[PDB]
Write a protein that binds this DNA or RNA. Structure first.
Ligand SMILES: Nc1ncnc2c1ncn2[C@@H]1O[C@H](COP(=O)(O)OP(=O)(O)OP(O)(O)=S)[C@@H](O)[C@H]1O
Ligand SMILES: Nc1ncnc2c1ncn2[C@@H]1O[C@H](COP(=O)(O)OP(=O)(O)OP(O)(O)=S)[C@@H](O)[C@H]1O
Ligand SMILES: Nc1ncnc2c1ncn2[C@@H]1O[C@H](COP(=O)(O)OP(=O)(O)O)[C@@H](O)[C@H]1O
Ligand SMILES: [Mg+2]
Ligand SMILES: [Mg+2]
Ligand SMILES: [Mg+2]
Ligand SMILES: [Zn+2]
Lengths: 647, 645, 245
DNA sequence: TTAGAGAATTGGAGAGTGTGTTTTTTTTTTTTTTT
DNA sequence: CACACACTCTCCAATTCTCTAA
């Protein structure tokens, strides 16, 4: 038998209080929630976000005038699933009639309403039928309590404290909690059925079946009164037209590396977003998901197979992300600060020296626009450098400021197919596709195998990576700007040896790079002293030794690229002339020098010069490409070439 | 159930006699009440009382023997007595509408002396079944914490009444009862529909760790044996793999083991496992004390007194490995590595590691591996690794499948388990190149990344690696640069703070000194042993389970470990300008010097200088770095690079 | 089955056996035993028709090398034979008796026989207070011209020693000499299986044809010879076994 | 031959005995032949 | 383990049948 227990909650009084709250609450138009229900009746909104701050304010207001409440906020944070049904029932009771001419072109549910009502009425006079969830066209959610900063939050308001996946103990099941973590795997949207709309071949009667079990059994038996009394034994046919579906997405939230105790492994927690919250979560997110932590049961046969050990999921209710005024601000900064010399030092404030490398990194960050083909607007630079030089620090600084920027190493791109056996997903990405409209910081570029060599070669002159797993020949758009940080083999760079001999990169791949910098360290007497002072100051004060203008926000570069991308600075005819004689004399001096053959100016150097000039004008208003721009571009190109011949 | 009531009242009398347990229950209750009345707080004390078995034996020997011999009949009554005691003396506050329904029985934990029950997973035979035993060993696997149902509370929306239902399993309750199919009752007795009330039900966490005997305890010629403990509630997540542990619990069996028609001659046995009641974390290889050794006020006073010595660094260093003659600078570097520099979690994602890495490359038989073994035996958390016997998967993470839950899971490798510890990689150069990229990544950014089997995580490996390597040839060749002597890439040698080169130069005075020292070492006789008697080991030091100016030349190893723990926990040195002057002067001198042309000096040596100076500041217990700290760090680094003195 | 009893061109055949109560933990892998058992039958459900897996139910085990451990990690020597050993130890020519009885068929090689006696007895293990231990086992290498009876000496040492494993350098791998990580067919869980240097724990392992070992296999013996521990970090396992060989 | 009182049989629901699942080969070592 | 399927065991009232009915 089932015993009985005494619990002081009194659901009926709570329901009366709930109805009073939905009727008699007006935030400091009429009532807020009545206005929301009016909008719902107009079919202009299908999300009743029941805030808990509002319920707390309602309780506080009625505390001074009768205390006509039973701590609802503390009564639904303990059991939220039942109160979702209570709120839905209270909304159906107080649902206002529409106050708008809503088109009813697709009124299948209304058609079923009136049809079944007429069929019942023609015999009711003898001359609930509809499930409560079937009629609802809204989804109800809970917004957790905000910060209290008062004695009310005396360790209470468990939905106020963002927990981690490890701290979600088993005794929180059924409560309305919130977790903080990084999404890792969000599934595709699937229509989860809430109530089926079986129709019988005879007897005319359709019987509905509410289901929340992840698995059900079709009725297929006309148990209707007419069918049973006539013993027709009719079978039932599903009608997806008259059924009710809710979009279902099954996310999965991990925990941040700062929440994991030492020696442990990050945990994970399944999230079941459904309703209007679908597609609000993506794998590259850090969120504070608020939901009801519920024990999904192993209903079926593995049920008896396992036992009391349940599996849990978080029925998400509210997702809070963490991650022309700006145009005026950046315009004013342009007027005040010299972008050319300021943004360069802003990229790597904690990295001393190598200013021209930073200037080239600005051009890569902006990049010219030459989408028209006959070509490409992606700037690629490689820093051959030297062991012990802060190439990796520069790469990380670029990654942390460049939108859609990723950092990766040669030895641990490409792509993998169908990683999980169960779901059997198709065409999982890699590292180059993630930085589609961004930059890939390929550290240890020399130590990167032939497969990735071919992959990056395809990406570099195709902007689209492809696979040939099972003859599908599918491709992934990866228009990523490439930033390489290869380092010389046999340790330190040898200036005497030829540059391509020092690093195991084929001349075919290196020659396609728009600009190349060889930036090696030399033991000096003053540069090292300033470097040591800088690093030690950073260690003391945890902040850079600020000695000049150091802008921080990257939105200025975003504004510049978005501004001049539509502008597309058109090159001048005199510019084209000066660059054709520039190529002529460059090739002439390349011959007369031939010392290292890693120079012969090539059509690709002209394309790189054009795109660098385009990027420079793209930074400075529109159509600024003139002699002034091309002189700086050619100066940068010549300096980069000379860098290969340093000392 | 007259016997049940008799046991309950006898244990109530015992609890009344020894008022310390009542005081502990009162303390737990007031702590919970104050936390409930007082915010970003989650520290709630569990409903668990640790009773000493010695007190129970002295009070009622019959009850004590019943607990130790047939706990399935004596522990439930004692737990019920404890629950009744806590309820009677409870402050009877206002209900929270959940504690009334959610059961919170007061569990019991035991300590004290066990005698014949102080066992190990190898010596845990079938004659110990259904008895309360304590097993000591190393945790190797830990299942995922998965909540399990023990009571479901239902609300019938037709009578306004609440109906519950208790659930029992073989792994939850000691006494055997009819298992429940774990299906919620969807209909009442009187044809009423019921809705399950989550949040008024009761779920308890459930974990299944695996404890195996210590590898050094295994008999000659056999691999360690393991047992499976089933921790639940407050004892979940108390242990992680690699932890030396001492689990107290009831050695239970389950199943029909054949005897089910399906098996007539089949000769399989029953599934046996321990229902853990207590987890006591003995650690640090000292066989009886925790890794975080308790610090008495006398010990802290003595530590502070010794920190004032002018040559505390020399005393601590020379006291590290007294059996290893010479290698004073390597000992100093090892001690500095034991208390690593402060770790800087800068903004914009920057992260400056505070762990010191030491590489020792040199001629054979120069105590390169005995120093590693000593670091293993001394550091609070050290993991032994060898070049040949370790793969990248075995060093970072292995994608295995959980057996308790049946799903894919990551298992921490040998160099994630050593998080916040040290890794002693012996025979470093023998590692295969495919298995060397992993340690390169870890020493680079101190986190491993996993991208296999549809798993994308980033485990934390903040370990300081000390490695011993051999030259490319048999012995170090002074006629070649220190690049072709070592078979490792410079991109990997750059991650080692100190690269000590040891040479077995053949002298005559030094050879005499070393021979005399080694012969003195080989004549050592243990205190409780006769001459010419083999040194048998029993390690049966488990007499009890649970917690039951000055200028010395050499400090004892346990005191050295206490000092290291105190220095790591307490003092967090901060850099100072007076030390930075020395640091920058020495770095500039080292960089642009003719003799240092062969040296690989880069900007990393500056960070090494800062880390060594901060470590030496930790040695002095000074909360700030001084000129002497930077001077000593510079001298040590100069010896590591040049080696003149 | 005994290697000298297998038929011509046949692999050795295994046989599942069951102990019970006081006959358990009585033998260790590698020991040669004589069993008095009941050749019984059980139908394991794991591929013909009406087939039955055979096994022996042990009723008595008569090893020749003592029980688990050596003499069960203690002395199980009858008083008469202990007195015999004491009488033997007082023999003034005990060294010559032991030397002359090491491979009596090998002419000469007196020094190698003396070194083999020293190897069989072994040194004395020490464990210092600071933690580091000093091994007490002797390793002997026999270089020389072919036909000098090195392999015969190794084969005899494999007999006289209470615990011994004979392996050839050619047919021997690093994971098969120290410890092999294997996957359990049923439970899908990795576990270790001891190699030659674990089977010969507490004894001597004779590695014939030493110079034929692959360069990456001979290295695995470096730790197990001096430190006398085998460190494994593979497939989520992290243990430091013991090999006092 | 017709509207109506008697025998005689057997199909459609249900008591019940025994079934049938969930249930898995990924990833990681170790070997071996070519490369 | 238990819920759902397939099916042997088992069983009375509506459906057929032939002696006595109109
Ligand atoms: N110009 C610089 N300014 C500040 N810190 C620097 C500078 N150059 C080097 N460093 C320091 O050098 C370290 C980072 O150097 P890395 O970029 O790792 O050298 P590396 O050339 O990448 O080494 P690898 O792995 O052989 S490529 C950090 O400790 C930096 O603080
Ligand atoms: N001094 C000896 N006394 C007796 N028999 C001997 C002696 N020297 C050699 N032999 C015999 O000569 C053969 C030597 O073969 P092995 O000893 O097996 O090979 P080996 O001596 O190890 O040389 P290897 O292995 O090819 S380097 C055996 O048949 C021995 O019995
Ligand atoms: N400086 C030293 N002082 C004392 N003993 C030493 C010293 N160097 C080597 N030994 C002895 O050499 C033996 C083996 O040393 P080991 O750790 O194998 O060195 P490696 O690993 O470099 O070969 C040890 O037992 C140790 O006692
Ligand atoms: Mg780098
Ligand atoms: Mg060594
Ligand atoms: Mg031979
Ligand atoms: Zn029908």
């Amino acid at each position: 038998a089932l015993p009985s227990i005494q619990l002081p909650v009194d659901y009926n009084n709570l329901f009366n209080e709930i109805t009073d709250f939905l009727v008699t609450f007006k935030q400091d138009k009429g009532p807020k929630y009545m206005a929301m229900l009016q909008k719902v009746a107009n079919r202009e909104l299908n999300s009743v976000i029941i805030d808990l701050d509002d319920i707390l304010q309602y309780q506080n207001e009625k505390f001074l005038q009768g205390t006509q409440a039973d701590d609802l906020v503390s009564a639904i944070q303990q059991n939220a699933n039942h109160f979702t049904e209570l709120f839905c029932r209270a909304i159906d009771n107080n649902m206002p009639l529409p106050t708008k001419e809503i088109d009813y072109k697709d009124d299948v549910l209304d058609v079923i309403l009136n049809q079944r009502r007429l069929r019942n009425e023609r015999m009711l006079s003898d001359r609930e039928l509809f499930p409560p969830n079937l009629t609802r066209r809204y989804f109800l959610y809970f917004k957790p309590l905000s910060q209290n900063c008062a004695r009310r939050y005396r360790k209470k308001a468990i939905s106020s404290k963002p927990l981690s996946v490890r701290q979600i103990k088993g005794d929180f099941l059924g409560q309305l909690i919130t977790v903080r973590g990084i999404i890792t795997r969000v599934s595709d949207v699937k229509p989860a059925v809430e109530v089926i709309a079986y129709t019988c071949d005879q007897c005319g009667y359709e019987v509905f079946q509410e289901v929340n079990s992840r698995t059900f059994t079709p009725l297929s038996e006309c148990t209707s009164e007419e069918c049973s009394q006539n013993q027709t034994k009719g079978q039932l046919f599903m009608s997806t037209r008259a059924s009710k579906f809710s979009a279902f997405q099954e996310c999965k939230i991990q925990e941040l590396s700062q929440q994991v105790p030492v020696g442990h492994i990050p945990r994970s927690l399944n999230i079941h977003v459904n309703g209007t919250l679908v597609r609000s979560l993506s794998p590259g997110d850090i969120v504070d998901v608020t939901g009801i932590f519920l024990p999904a049961p192993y209903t079926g046969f593995k049920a008896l197979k396992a036992g009391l050990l349940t599996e849990t999921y978080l029925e998400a209710q509210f997702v809070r992300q963490h991650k022309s005024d700006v145009e005026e601000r950046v315009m004013e900064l342009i007027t005040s600060g010299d972008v050319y010399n300021r943004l360069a030092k802003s990229i790597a404030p904690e990295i001393y020296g190598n200013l021209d490398v930073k200037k080239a990194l600005l051009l890569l960050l902006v990049g010219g626009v030459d989408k028209r083909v006959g070509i490409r607007g992606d700037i690629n630079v490689c820093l051959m450098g030297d062991p012990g030089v802060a190439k990796s620090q520069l790469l990380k600084a670029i990654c942390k400021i460049s939108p859609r920027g990723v950092y990766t190493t040669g030895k641990g791109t490409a792509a993998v197919m169908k990683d999980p056996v169960t779901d059997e997903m198709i065409l999982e990405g890699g590292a180059l596709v993630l930085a589609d409209n961004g930059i890939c910081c390929i550290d240890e570029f020399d130590k990167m195998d032939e497969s990735d060599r071919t992959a990056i070669h395809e990406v570099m002159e195709q902007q689209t990576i492809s696979i040939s797993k099972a003859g599908i020949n599918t491709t992934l758009n990866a228009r990523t700007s490439i930033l390489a940080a290869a380092n010389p083999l046999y340790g330190r760079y040898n200036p005497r040896l030829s540059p391509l001999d020092n690093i195991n990169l084929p001349a075919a791949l290196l020659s396609r790079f728009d600009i190349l910098f060889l930036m090696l360290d030399i033991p000096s007497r003053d540069d090292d002293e300033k470097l040591a002072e800088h690093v030690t100051y950073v260690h003391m004060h945890n902040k850079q030794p600020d000695l000049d203008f150091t802008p921080v926000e990257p939105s200025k570069m975003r504004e510049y690229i978005a501004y001049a991308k539509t502008k597309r600075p058109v090159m001048s005819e005199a510019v084209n002339d000066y660059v054709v004689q520039a190529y002529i004399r460059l090739r002439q001096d390349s011959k007369r020098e031939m010392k290292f053959s890693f120079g012969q100016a090539t059509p690709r150097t002209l394309l790189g010069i054009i795109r660098l000039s385009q990027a420079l004008a793209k930074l400075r208003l529109a159509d600024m490409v003139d002699i002034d721009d091309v002189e700086e571009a050619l100066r940068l190109v010549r300096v980069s070439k000379e860098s290969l011949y340093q000392e | 159930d007259a016997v049940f009531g008799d046991r309950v009242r006898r244990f109530q009398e015992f609890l009344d006699t020894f008022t310390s347990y009542r005081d502990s229950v009162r303390s737990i209750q007031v702590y919970n009440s104050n936390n409930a009345a007082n915010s970003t707080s989650l520290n709630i004390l569990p409903h668990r009382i640790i009773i000493s078995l010695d007190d129970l034996r002295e009070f009622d020997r019959s009850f004590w023997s019943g607990i130790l011999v047939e706990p399935a009949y004596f522990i439930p009554p004692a737990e019920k007595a404890l629950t009744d005691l806590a309820d009677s003396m409870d402050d009877v506050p206002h209900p929270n509408a959940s504690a009334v329904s959610s059961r919170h029985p007061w569990k019991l934990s035991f300590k004290g002396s066990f005698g014949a029950h102080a066992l190990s997973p190898r010596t845990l035979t079938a004659q110990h079944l259904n008895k309360l035993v304590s097993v000591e060993g190393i945790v190797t696997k830990t299942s995922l914490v998965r909540p399990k149902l023990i009571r479901s509370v239902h609300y019938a929306a037709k009578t306004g009444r609440f109906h519950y239902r208790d659930y029992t399993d073989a792994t939850t309750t000691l006494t055997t009862r009819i298992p429940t199919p774990a299906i919620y009752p969807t209909e009442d007795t009187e044809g009423n529909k019921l809705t399950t009330e989550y949040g008024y039900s009761t779920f308890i966490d459930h974990q299944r760790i695996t404890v195996q005997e210590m590898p050094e305890m295994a008999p000659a010629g056999q691999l360690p044996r393991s047992i499976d403990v089933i921790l639940d509630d407050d004892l979940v997540d108390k242990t992680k793999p690699g932890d030396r542990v001492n689990v107290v619990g009831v050695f239970k069996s389950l199943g029909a083991g054949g005897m089910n028609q399906s098996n007539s001659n089949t000769l399989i046995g029953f599934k046996t496992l321990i229902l853990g009641n207590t987890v006591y974390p003995l650690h640090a290889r000292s066989t009886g004390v925790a890794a975080r050794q308790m610090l008495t006020d006398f010990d802290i006073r003595n530590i502070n007194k010794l920190s004032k010595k002018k040559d505390i660094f020399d005393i601590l260093s020379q006291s590290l490995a007294p059996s290893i003659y010479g290698h004073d600078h390597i000992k100093k570097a090892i001690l500095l590595m034991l208390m690593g520099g402060v770790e800087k979690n800068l903004e914009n994602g920057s992260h400056l590691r505070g762990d010191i890495n030491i590489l020792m490359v040199g001629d054979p038989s120069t105590a390169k591996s005995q120093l590693l073994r000593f670091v293993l035996n001394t550091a609070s958390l050290a993991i032994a690794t060898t070049g040949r016997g370790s793969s990248g998967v075995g060093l970072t993470a292995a994608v295995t499948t959980d057996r308790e839950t049946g799903e894919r899971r990551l298992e921490a490798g040998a160099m994630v388990l050593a998080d916040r510890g040290v890794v002693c990689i012996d025979e470093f150069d023998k590692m295969t190149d495919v298995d060397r990229v992993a340690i390169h990544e870890v020493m680079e950014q101190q986190t491993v990344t996993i991208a296999k089997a549809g798993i994308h995580t980033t485990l934390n490996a903040r370990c300081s690696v000390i490695a011993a390597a051999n030259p490319v040839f048999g012995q170090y060749d002074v006629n070649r640069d220190p690049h072709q002597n070592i078979a490792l890439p410079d991109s990997l040698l750059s991650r080692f703070d100190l690269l000590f080169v040891v040479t077995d130069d053949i002298n005559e005075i030094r050879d005499r000194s070393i021979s005399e020292h080694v012969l003195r070492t080989h004549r050592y006789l243990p205190p409780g042993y006769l001459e010419g008697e083999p040194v048998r080991e029993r390690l049966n030091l488990s007499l009890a389970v649970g917690e039951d100016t000055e200028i010395p030349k050499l400090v004892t190893i346990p005191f050295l470990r206490k000092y290291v723990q105190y220095a790591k926990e307490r003092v967090i040195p901060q850099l100072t300008q007076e030390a930075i002057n020395v640091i920058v002067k020495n770095y500039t001198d080292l960089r642009n010097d003719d003799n240092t042309k062969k040296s690989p000096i880069t900007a990393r040596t500056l960070e090494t200088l800062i880390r060594l100076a901060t470590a030496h500041a930790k040695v002095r217990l000074s909360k700030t770095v001084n000129k002497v700290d930077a001077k000593v760090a510079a001298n040590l680094l100069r010896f590591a690079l040049l080696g003149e003195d | 089955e005994i290697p000298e009893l297998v038929p011509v061109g046949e692999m050795p055949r295994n046989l599942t056996m069951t102990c019970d109560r006081y006959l358990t933990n009585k033998v260790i892998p590698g020991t040669r035993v004589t069993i008095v058992g009941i050749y019984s039958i059980y139908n394991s459900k794991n591929s013909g028709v009406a087939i039955r897996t055979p096994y022996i139910k042990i009723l008595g085990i008569q090893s020749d090398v003592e029980t688990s451990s050596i003499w069960n990690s203690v002395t199980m020597f009858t008083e008469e034979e202990e007195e015999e050993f004491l009488q033997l130890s007082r023999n003034p020519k005990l060294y010559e008796i032991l030397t002359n009885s090491i491979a009596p068929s090998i002419f000469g090689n007196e020094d190698i026989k003396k070194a083999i006696v020293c190897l069989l007895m072994g040194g004395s293990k020490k464990i210092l207070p600071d933690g580091m231990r000093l091994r007490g086992d002797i390793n002997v290498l026999l270089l020389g011209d072919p036909g000098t009876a090195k392999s015969q000496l190794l084969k005899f040492v494999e007999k006289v020693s209470p615990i011994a494993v004979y392996t050839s350098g050619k047919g021997s791998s690093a994971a098969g000499l120290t410890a092999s990580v294997q996957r359990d067919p049923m439970t899908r869980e990795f576990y270790l299986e001891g190699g030659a240097m674990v089977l010969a724990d507490g004894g001597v392992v004779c590695i014939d044809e030493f110079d034929k070992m692959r360069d990456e296999d001979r290295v695995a013996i470096h730790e197990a010879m001096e430190q006398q521990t085998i460190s494994i970090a593979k497939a989520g396992i992290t243990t430091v076994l013991n090999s006092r060989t």
